[PDB]
Design a protein around this motif. Structure first.
Motif, mmCIF file in Angstrom:
data_model
loop_
_atom_site.group_PDB
_atom_site.id
_atom_site.type_symbol
_atom_site.label_atom_id
_atom_site.label_comp_id
_atom_site.label_asym_id
_atom_site.label_seq_id
_atom_site.Cartn_x
_atom_site.Cartn_y
_atom_site.Cartn_z
ATOM 1 N N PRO A 1 2.562 -33.839 -48.333
ATOM 2 C CA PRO A 1 2.059 -33.197 -47.104
ATOM 3 C C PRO A 1 0.834 -32.317 -47.300
ATOM 4 C CG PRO A 1 4.128 -32.221 -47.832
ATOM 5 C CD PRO A 1 3.985 -33.517 -48.538
ATOM 6 N N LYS A 2 0.689 -31.697 -48.466
ATOM 7 C CA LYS A 2 -0.466 -30.846 -48.619
ATOM 8 C C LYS A 2 -1.736 -31.667 -48.561
ATOM 9 C CE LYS A 2 2.526 -28.446 -51.658
ATOM 10 N NZ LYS A 2 2.909 -27.034 -51.408
ATOM 11 N N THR A 3 -1.713 -32.853 -49.157
ATOM 12 C CA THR A 3 -2.942 -33.683 -49.154
ATOM 13 C C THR A 3 -3.235 -34.224 -47.756
ATOM 14 O OG1 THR A 3 -1.944 -35.803 -49.809
ATOM 15 C CG2 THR A 3 -2.635 -34.367 -51.574
ATOM 16 N N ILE A 4 -2.193 -34.576 -46.993
ATOM 17 C CA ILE A 4 -2.388 -35.029 -45.622
ATOM 18 C C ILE A 4 -2.982 -33.913 -44.731
ATOM 19 C CG2 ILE A 4 -1.185 -35.840 -43.536
ATOM 20 C CD1 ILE A 4 0.858 -37.035 -45.681
ATOM 21 N N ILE A 5 -2.407 -32.719 -44.799
ATOM 22 C CA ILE A 5 -2.950 -31.574 -44.042
ATOM 23 C C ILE A 5 -4.431 -31.365 -44.382
ATOM 24 C CG2 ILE A 5 -2.952 -29.069 -43.667
ATOM 25 C CD1 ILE A 5 -0.599 -30.294 -42.341
ATOM 26 N N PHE B 1 -8.142 -32.376 -32.491
ATOM 27 C CA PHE B 1 -6.751 -31.951 -32.828
ATOM 28 C C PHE B 1 -6.814 -31.048 -34.020
ATOM 29 C CE2 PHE B 1 -6.138 -34.147 -36.811
ATOM 30 C CZ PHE B 1 -7.074 -35.164 -36.748
ATOM 31 N N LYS B 2 -5.714 -30.358 -34.280
ATOM 32 C CA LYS B 2 -5.651 -29.403 -35.379
ATOM 33 C C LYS B 2 -4.291 -29.577 -36.063
ATOM 34 C CE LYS B 2 -7.469 -25.306 -35.040
ATOM 35 N NZ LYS B 2 -8.631 -25.711 -35.899
ATOM 36 N N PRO B 3 -4.259 -29.791 -37.389
ATOM 37 C CA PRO B 3 -3.008 -29.958 -38.066
ATOM 38 C C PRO B 3 -2.397 -28.640 -38.446
ATOM 39 C CG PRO B 3 -4.721 -30.138 -39.645
ATOM 40 C CD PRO B 3 -5.382 -30.020 -38.306
ATOM 41 N N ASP C 1 7.765 -31.856 -40.293
ATOM 42 C CA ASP C 1 7.041 -30.747 -40.883
ATOM 43 C C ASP C 1 5.577 -30.654 -40.496
ATOM 44 O OD1 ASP C 1 9.408 -30.012 -42.223
ATOM 45 O OD2 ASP C 1 8.712 -30.686 -44.134
ATOM 46 N N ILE C 2 4.900 -31.794 -40.375
ATOM 47 C CA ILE C 2 3.493 -31.818 -40.046
ATOM 48 C C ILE C 2 3.383 -32.052 -38.539
ATOM 49 C CG2 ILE C 2 1.279 -32.990 -40.373
ATOM 50 C CD1 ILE C 2 2.508 -33.977 -43.054
#
Ligand SMILES: *[C@@H]1O[C@H](CO)[C@@H](O[C@@H]2O[C@H](CO)[C@@H](O[C@@H]3O[C@H](CO[C@H]4O[C@H](CO)[C@@H](O)[C@H](O[C@H]5O[C@H](CO)[C@@H](O)[C@H](O)[C@@H]5O[C@H]5O[C@H](CO)[C@@H](O)[C@H](O)[C@@H]5O)[C@@H]4O)[C@@H](O)[C@H](O[C@H]4O[C@H](CO)[C@@H](O)[C@H](O)[C@@H]4O[C@H]4O[C@H](CO)[C@@H](O)[C@H](O)[C@@H]4O)[C@@H]3O)[C@H](O)[C@H]2NC(C)=O)[C@H](O)[C@H]1NC(C)=O
Ligand SMILES: Cc1nnn(Cc2cc(C(F)(F)F)ccc2CCC(=O)N(C)CCOc2ccc(S(N)(=O)=O)cc2)n1
Ligand SMILES: [Ca+2]
Ligand SMILES: [Ca+2]
Ligand SMILES: [K+]
Ligand code: NA
Ligand SMILES: [Zn+2]
Length: 805
Positions: free
Chosen positions: A354-358, A370-372, A392-393
């Motif tokens: 998830p950190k890399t996707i964010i 949009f804003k993650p 979570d995301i």
């Protein structure tokens, strides 16, 4: 399996659901494909339509007709709704002048005024004014009854979450209907609008109004209606149930309309095609009210006209595609549209991160729509995190836009011109509230309020005790003529200690320094008086907050501010100060830049230390009472007490310092003084509730100093801004925030610019109710005012939204 061989004779729209395999005749039988073989014939009659005509008056009853115009119809409870108009010379309800309903005027045998909820899907708030000329029945309800200019939905601003919130008083995170589509990883099951999984009771938490009623001896109509049942038949069914014998007749009912939402998706909120759906809804209201008038119930029943959410202009071309940001788009599952929710496609893919996707979705395109967020970082006002069905995301989508995974998703499904789902403060998402009846007020406008409050009021209207919910019972008392709920303030659980000077300077080994060694009976007595609370009236305007849990804390008084200092969390729970319109801003003097002073009222053991901040390379500190707003150079020394210090990431100090140095004085100038209460919040488990000590996940390195997840401020002044905040005779005005305590400003794409270009925008996003802060802190504010408690409850639920009108 259904044995559709049974019959609906004498069972049409029965209230008790029969169990499989026996066939059903209730208002949802169509939805379960389980109606008896003769349901259409018997229960969905359409012959001769829905309106009496002069030639039908006094006819011989033909049981085949949809509704009746025979002499016996009134006793049968099955006249067409315009029967008395056409056949007996009466007026339509809408043509009668409004006359105050001071008391219920109910037929004999009625134990309480019934409640009818007339719910409309996609009814945007501005339709009440913009459509008023084509909605005469609605406009009479609105003008003669009690109305708000708008009612705020819950996030996400979708149908199922909002209708279930109306029914339960609960945030979606608590009731469990967190979207129209959901995956529950514990169940390993998917919920969809279409299909049978949604019928499983395990999805639906809390206790909806119809269950609350039934459990307490009050009979309810079935609220739900299969789509194929025409609106005229829904109204006739309600009116027939109202003609039941006293022991069989429900006291609470709902009508539902899929309009204007259905057309609004096709045509946009103000498409010229929208007039006709609005006219049709108004006609349906008119049928109900004419029908009630025939039954002598039009001055007996309380009617609520209410919507679930509004409608925004949204078209296919305004779609952001994750395939333009992510290399790995086939490794994710997206719930798309006006919000995004991302999870891993496969729980066996150990390369999912998830950190890399964010990071790949953060501020990548200059006009990005949009804003993650990790869900715990979403504005607290959304109350959208504490459920395993919420991924979570999260992607917060700008109004007028969609997000999708890939382009082929959008042309393999243009057509639509409207949608909803966005942030519940967005003006286009706002919806409607009107209450009309003996229990509501007459010709009364009330301020906007949140839909989570209505369950309590509906319970009040029916004499029910509400189930535990997220409303603030009493905050809507001003809508009601009678049946108000009169709560008592909560009892204070922990009483404060009032320490005096108990420690010498040399007892402290905190690693702090301060250039404060420069020195009078005139002024020394005067400063001892400040430490005993002599300015407290100026700075604590609404009494001390009450602490509603067991803890150990000290009240500390100063010239310019008062605080409640927690011995357990080593910092204030709250710091309270008043800044007049005339207050001057000053600097932190050179010689005080790194000053931190021991507080001789508080033990070294219950104090922070400067050495922990030196050693924690990630963490700095700020002050709750701002040294910039000191009343004098001598008073400013108090602002550098160790008991006023709180842990702050440098990135957050940018935000906090600008709030304190610039914005507080700006608000004092604009509002004619402000009272500020600021403090930390700890919500590491994102449940919207104050963490206990053992829930804290991060401390200042090597210390027992807990790191807040958020910082709050409550900013109060006189509603009549011609009076100063410290000499206000009447109602109050409030705005508040809950700012996320983040180690970066990645949320703010323009944060490289001067704080004048981004900090206030951040703060507006994280606007809060006082009640939200109460939940997150265990504190109870506004304990000592001259105002009615219900008035104060309304004030605590206020949200300053920052939208224009
Ligand atoms: C908005 O208003 C609502 C309503 O008031 C507030 O929610 C309440 O908050 C309380 C605290 O979070 C919570 O109280 C807990 O109840 C547990 C029993 O819960 C069941 O029974 C109730 C009553 O019938 C029922 O309503 C619950 O419904 C939830 O769960 C079902 C799934 O089974 C869902 O269908 C439903 O939607 C709802 O889910 C929501 O709430 C749950 C939490 O209960 C969340 O996990 C979901 O994400 C979702 O948000 C339940 O069926 C009870 O067991 C708890 O007790 C523990 O904690 C106490 C602290 O006092 C401790 O002393 C105990 O030892 C115990 O700990 C043990 O279990 C721990 C966890 O397994 C374990 O770690 C320990 O080591 C121990 O073994 C607790 O009292 C109450 O249930 C909810 N109610 C609802 C309807 O949501 C909400 O806070 C308000 N919001 C705000 C911001 O103010
Ligand atoms: C969502 C939701 N939450 N609460 N309601 C009822 C409701 C409440 C309220 C409230 F007074 F609150 F304003 C008003 C009106 C309704 C009825 C809504 C309705 O009739 N619709 C949306 C079409 C059929 O929708 C079904 C949904 C689920 C099943 S299920 N549970 O069997 O799977 C069946 C039918 N709907
Ligand atoms: Ca809807
Ligand atoms: Ca918490
Ligand atoms: K540091
Ligand atoms: Na940034
Ligand atoms: Zn819709």
């Amino acid at each position: 399996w259904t044995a559709t061989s049974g019959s609906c004779k004498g069972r049409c729209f029965e209230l008790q659901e029969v169990g499989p395999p026996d066939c059903r005749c209730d208002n949802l039988c169509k939805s379960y494909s389980s109606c008896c073989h003769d349901f259409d014939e018997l229960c969905l009659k359409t012959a001769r339509g829905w309106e009496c005509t002069k030639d039908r008056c006094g006819e011989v009853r033909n049981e085949e007709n949809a509704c009746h115009c025979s002499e016996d119809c009134l006793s049968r409870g099955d006249c067409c709704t315009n029967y008395q108009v056409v056949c007996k010379g009466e007026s339509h309800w809408v043509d009668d002048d409004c006359e105050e309903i001071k008391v219920p005027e109910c037929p004999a045998g009625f134990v309480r005024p019934p409640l009818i909820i007339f719910s409309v899907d996609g009814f945007r708030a501005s339709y009440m004014k913009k459509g008023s000329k084509v909605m005469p029945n609605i406009e009479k309800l609105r003008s003669c009854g009690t109305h708000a200019p708008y009612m705020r939905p819950v996030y996400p601003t979708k149908t199922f979450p909002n209708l279930y919130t109306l029914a339960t008083g609960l945030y979606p995170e608590s009731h469990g209907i967190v979207g129209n589509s959901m995956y529950d990883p514990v169940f390993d099951a998917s919920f969809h609008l279409r299909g049978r999984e949604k019928f499983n009771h395990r999805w639906w938490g809390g206790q909806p109004l119809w269950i609350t009623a039934t459990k307490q001896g009050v009979r309810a109509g079935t609220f739900f209606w299969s789509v194929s049942i025409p609106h005229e038949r829904r109204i006739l069914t309600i009116l027939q149930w109202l003609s039941l014998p006293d022991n069989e007749r429900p006291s609470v009912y709902a009508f539902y309309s899929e309009q204007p939402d259905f057309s609004g998706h096709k045509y946009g909120p103000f498409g010229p095609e929208m007039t006709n759906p609005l006219r049709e809804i108004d006609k349906t209201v008119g049928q109900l009210m004419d029908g009630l008038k025939q039954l002598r119930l039009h001055r007996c029943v309380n009617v609520i006209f209410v919507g679930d959410h509004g409608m925004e202009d949204v078209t296919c071309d305004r779609t952001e595609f994750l395939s333009n940001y992510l290399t790995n788009v086939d490794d994710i599952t997206l719930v798309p549209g006006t919000l995004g929710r991302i999870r891993a496609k496969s729980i066996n893919n150990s390369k999912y991160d998830p950190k890399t996707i964010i990071a790949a979705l953060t501020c990548k395109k200059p006009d990005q729509h949009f804003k993650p967020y990790m869900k715990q970082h979403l504005p607290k006002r959304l109350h959208y995190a504490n459920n395993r069905r919420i991924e979570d995301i999260h992607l917060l989508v700008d109004r007028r836009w969609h997000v999708a995974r890939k382009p082929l998703d959008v042309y393999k499904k243009c057509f639509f011109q409207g949608d909803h789902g966005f942030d519940n403060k967005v003006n286009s998402m706002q919806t409607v509230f009107v209450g009309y009846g003996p229990t509501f007020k007459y010709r009364t406008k009330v301020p906007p309020f949140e839909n989570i409050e209505l369950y309590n009021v509906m319970c009040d209207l029916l004499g029910l005790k509400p189930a535990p919910n997220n409303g603030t019972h009493g905050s809507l008392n001003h809508l009601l003529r009678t049946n108000t709920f009169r709560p008592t303030m909560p009892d204070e659980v922990s009483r404060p200690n009032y320490p005096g000077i108990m420690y010498l300077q040399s007892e402290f080994d905190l690693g702090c320094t301060c250039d404060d060694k420069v020195e009078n009976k005139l002024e020394e007595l005067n400063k001892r008086l400040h430490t005993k609370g002599s300015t407290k009236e100026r700075h604590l305007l609404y009494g001390r907050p009450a602490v509603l849990y067991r803890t150990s804390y000290d009240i500390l008084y100063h010239t310019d501010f008062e605080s409640g200092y927690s011995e357990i969390f080593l910092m204030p729970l709250w710091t309270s100060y008043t800044i007049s319109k005339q207050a001057e801003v000053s600097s932190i003097p050179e010689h005080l830049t790194n000053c931190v002073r021991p507080d001789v009222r508080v033990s070294p053991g219950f104090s922070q230390n400067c050495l922990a901040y030196k050693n924690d390379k990630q963490m700095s500190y700020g002050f709750l009472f701002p040294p910039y707003l000191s009343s004098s150079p001598e008073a400013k020394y108090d602002a550098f007490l160790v008991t006023n210090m709180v842990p702050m990431y440098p990135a957050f100090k940018r935000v906090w310092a600008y709030f304190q140095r610039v914005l507080v004085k700006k608000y004092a100038s604009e509002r004619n003084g402000v009272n500020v209460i600021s403090g930390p919040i700890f919500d590491y488990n994102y449940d919207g509730l104050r963490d206990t000590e053992d829930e804290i996940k991060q401390y200042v390195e090597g210390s027992s100093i807990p790191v807040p997840t958020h910082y709050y401020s409550i900013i109060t002044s006189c509603l009549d801004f011609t009076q100063p905040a410290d000499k206000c005779d009447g109602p109050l005005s409030v705005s508040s925030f809950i700012l996320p305590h983040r180690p970066d400003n990645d949320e703010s794409c323009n944060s490289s610019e001067d704080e004048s270009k981004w900090v206030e925008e951040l703060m507006k996003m994280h606007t809060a109710r006082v009640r939200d802060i109460e939940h997150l802190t265990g504190l109870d504010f506004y304990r000592k005012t001259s105002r009615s408690y219900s008035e104060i409850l309304t004030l605590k639920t206020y949200l300053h939204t920052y939208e224009s009108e």
